[PDB]
Design an enzyme around this catalytic site. Sequence first.
Site, mmCIF file in Angstrom:
data_model
loop_
_atom_site.group_PDB
_atom_site.id
_atom_site.type_symbol
_atom_site.label_atom_id
_atom_site.label_comp_id
_atom_site.label_asym_id
_atom_site.label_seq_id
_atom_site.Cartn_x
_atom_site.Cartn_y
_atom_site.Cartn_z
ATOM 1 N N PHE C 25 32.222 40.928 37.250
ATOM 2 C CA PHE C 25 32.392 40.295 38.554
ATOM 3 C C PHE C 25 33.869 40.178 38.915
ATOM 4 C CE2 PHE C 25 29.273 38.056 41.311
ATOM 5 C CZ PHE C 25 30.118 37.746 42.354
ATOM 6 N N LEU C 28 34.899 43.550 39.860
ATOM 7 C CA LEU C 28 34.348 43.809 41.186
ATOM 8 C C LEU C 28 35.207 43.184 42.276
ATOM 9 C CD1 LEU C 28 31.392 44.984 42.236
ATOM 10 C CD2 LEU C 28 30.991 42.563 42.674
ATOM 11 N N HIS C 29 35.686 41.957 42.054
ATOM 12 C CA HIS C 29 36.575 41.326 43.027
ATOM 13 C C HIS C 29 37.919 42.043 43.104
ATOM 14 C CE1 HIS C 29 39.557 38.662 44.708
ATOM 15 N NE2 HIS C 29 40.079 38.457 43.512
ATOM 16 N N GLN C 30 38.429 42.517 41.962
ATOM 17 C CA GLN C 30 39.665 43.297 41.974
ATOM 18 C C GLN C 30 39.483 44.632 42.690
ATOM 19 O OE1 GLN C 30 42.884 42.431 41.522
ATOM 20 N NE2 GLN C 30 43.323 42.892 39.370
ATOM 21 N N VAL C 33 39.287 43.779 46.499
ATOM 22 C CA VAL C 33 40.579 43.485 47.115
ATOM 23 C C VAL C 33 41.460 44.734 47.125
ATOM 24 C CG1 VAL C 33 41.852 42.608 45.066
ATOM 25 C CG2 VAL C 33 42.304 41.652 47.352
#
Lengths: 293, 108, 185, 305
Positions: C25, C28-30, C33
């Site tokens: 997760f 996934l956020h990296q 962004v």
Amino acid sequence: LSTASVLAFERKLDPSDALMSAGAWAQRDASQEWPAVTVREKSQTVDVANLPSDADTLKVRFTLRVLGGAGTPSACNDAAYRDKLLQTVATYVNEQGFAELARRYAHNLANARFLWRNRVGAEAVEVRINHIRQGEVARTWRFDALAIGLRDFKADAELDALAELIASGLSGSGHVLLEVVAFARIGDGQEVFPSQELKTLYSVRDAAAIHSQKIGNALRTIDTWYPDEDGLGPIAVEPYGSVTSQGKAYRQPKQKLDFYTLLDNWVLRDEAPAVEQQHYVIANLIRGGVFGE
Amino acid sequence: GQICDEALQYAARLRELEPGWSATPGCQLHDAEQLWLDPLRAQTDETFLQRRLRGDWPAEVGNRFANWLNRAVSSDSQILGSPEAAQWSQELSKELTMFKEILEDERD
Amino acid sequence: MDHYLDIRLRPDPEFPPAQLMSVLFGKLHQALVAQGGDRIGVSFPDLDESRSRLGERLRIHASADDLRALLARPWLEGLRDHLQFGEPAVVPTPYRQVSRVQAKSNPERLRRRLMRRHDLSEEEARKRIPDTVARALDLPFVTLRSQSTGQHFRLFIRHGPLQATAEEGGFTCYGLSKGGFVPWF
Amino acid sequence: VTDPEALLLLPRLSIQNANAISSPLTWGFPSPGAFTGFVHALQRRVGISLDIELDGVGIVCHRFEAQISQPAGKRTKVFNLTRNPLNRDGSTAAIVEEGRAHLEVSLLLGVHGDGLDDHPAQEIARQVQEQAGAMRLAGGSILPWCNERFPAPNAELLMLGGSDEQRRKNQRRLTRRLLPGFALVSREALLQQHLETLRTTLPEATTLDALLDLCRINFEPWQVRDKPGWLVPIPAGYNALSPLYLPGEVRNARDRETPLRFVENLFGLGEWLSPHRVAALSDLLWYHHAEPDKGLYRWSTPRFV
RNA sequence: CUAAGAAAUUCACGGCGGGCUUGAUGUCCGCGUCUACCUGGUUCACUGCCGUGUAGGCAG
């Protein structure tokens, strides 16, 4: 009859602590001025391994000596039990010397399982294995990036030499000493995580490091055939095969596939199991402990 | 049996009229071995306060009861030549196991 | 959206499923962004509301090109041996939202908030903000690393009410609902 | 004598200015006949409207302080009295000596009627607990709860409903709130065999009683004999010494509807055993049974072991 | 329907004056605590934020 009222085994495959260091990539041959990872107290109390701006990759240097002589116990009460255990391990090493065990230990030395949080997300992890008997190198070893894996074990063109070295050491005919370092590209300023004490991170002098028992636990991930399944990958050797991370203790005492249930009819009732379970019992004798009552 | 009952009665009488049981000066060993004569819940308890405030078992109690049974009767190296001493030892082990099963439900 | 990818957690002898779920997760956020946009959402097909568990599957929703770009990015580098991937396929379903539920479960942060916002004292903030303001959540959570502060935080996730149709809306950089709806199957 | 369906537990019950003497030969805890009569009076007050029955008691004695004093280097005790009001003149003539005691007892009552059949479980216990707080249990008033940590735990425990391991868990859960007490049970068979033991000269029961509860010191021809338990002499019911009468016959009876008898106490044996050392709690209930053919009117506890 | 039902121990007070406890002493000899272990419960069901109001994006 019965087993010994007290019996214990010293460990083999002795690990040290793993001093962490930070540096730049393509500086792997000159890891003698890489500054050690310093822990600082900055405020909510946090402990972050702040790598320097000019230092991206992490190198975890530790050492490992294998001893050999896994048959003879430390302190056994019964005089009629030591000789039959020695005869059992002698017939084991005579029918098939532990070369597949040494191959799996070599594969444990292939991928940096001793890195736990500092292995995920890494670009490439190269373990560098030396072999020092007199005070200098004898035949060094460099390892690949796709052969790292976590479950794909195979006869590699040079891992067989490392495996036969571990087997020649563990056989009891001349011990070996390996300086195992591991370079890995993790991220500039990204918090690599070593072990922690009761936050307080575990620290040897002027650095941070990982406990010896954690590296040993990561290094004895041999156990494959336990009766539940074998799909997820291999687990670490334990008499009850317990694993806290998955959260359910395998190798249940209702089944006779545990270590205390396999050795007890190996030496007394002479019920020799299959080659994988004999590998499991022997690898449970290379880790030591306090057996018996 | 009378000694075990007197010990249980003393343990019940101790932790009934003494609500003071928490962190304080000189109360270190009164949290692990004091799982029997332990107070109620505190005012500043944490989320996982079932181990650091009140463990859900008499963890140090069984070894203490075994040591008290070993010290109250001086058993020698020839105390099991017949079943007389060994029967009392088995009865002491059974009474200790029963007291442990009773004290395990104390923290609940 | 119309294209989904199921990334299944292979069970790990070294880590629980919550650990690899939180690591994927964060990656996934990296990757979101580093990609940008508000069109990519996430869903958890093996949700258990009773046991408050996220299961072992992560189902990402975007267009086909976003899935085919995220397959060939090094946001899976080092995690290809921890996971197992399917193919980018079309969705077969009602819709629901994926919402982050924050809480004022600590009176001390609101006490320092009132001190910073009205120049009051500690005792007046103690009378104004008592200790019964702590909020309990029976919601599953993932544990990630923080940016400005450096203390690990848990993201609570709530799967919203199942509605037969979807509404127009964007997503955040975590795959969570900021107006958008994800199909549940 | 019927086994109950439920054991309604009456909680920590402070009763003050009780009757300490309770018998012409004992002075300690009050008679268990007081407890059986208390339960029968509580039945006559609440059980007829609650459609239940109430038979037995569990006498546990959490604490007990007598109103006594040891006068000036003596091995005996004397009783603290209370100053009475004066006569027609200022005489202070008559001073009859009766003892007092404050005891914290907690009873457990055997229910027989329609407890769960036509009524709820917590409401019957609440009603009987707020009914037993307006009466007296041994000759002294039942003090209510006005202190802190408000319990009101009238556990109306069902017994015949449930599995066996759940029933044993219920027994060991109810025994948790009998924590510092001591159950009193009769040991008539023990006194009988102890009478047959020393029947070598004269097998009087009043001599086997008066030579068991003591400490009989006897040296080696230098010790005291091994204490078998906490043996006490108790009054164990009455024994008639005059035949039955008619209601309005005998002068100055308490009421002219029931017959009268002139009776005399019977002294049995009792033990204060811990509540952990019994199998079930319903084993230690005190019932009073009478045989009006002869003169025996005996309270006891059947199934006491 | 309880060895049931009932109950005011009250008023006052100078303990007090003295004192040598003291002398001497050999605690001795000897010892194998061993072997193993993932703290990655959350060292606070967190932390400064657009409006004194919950509505959040840069190592978050």
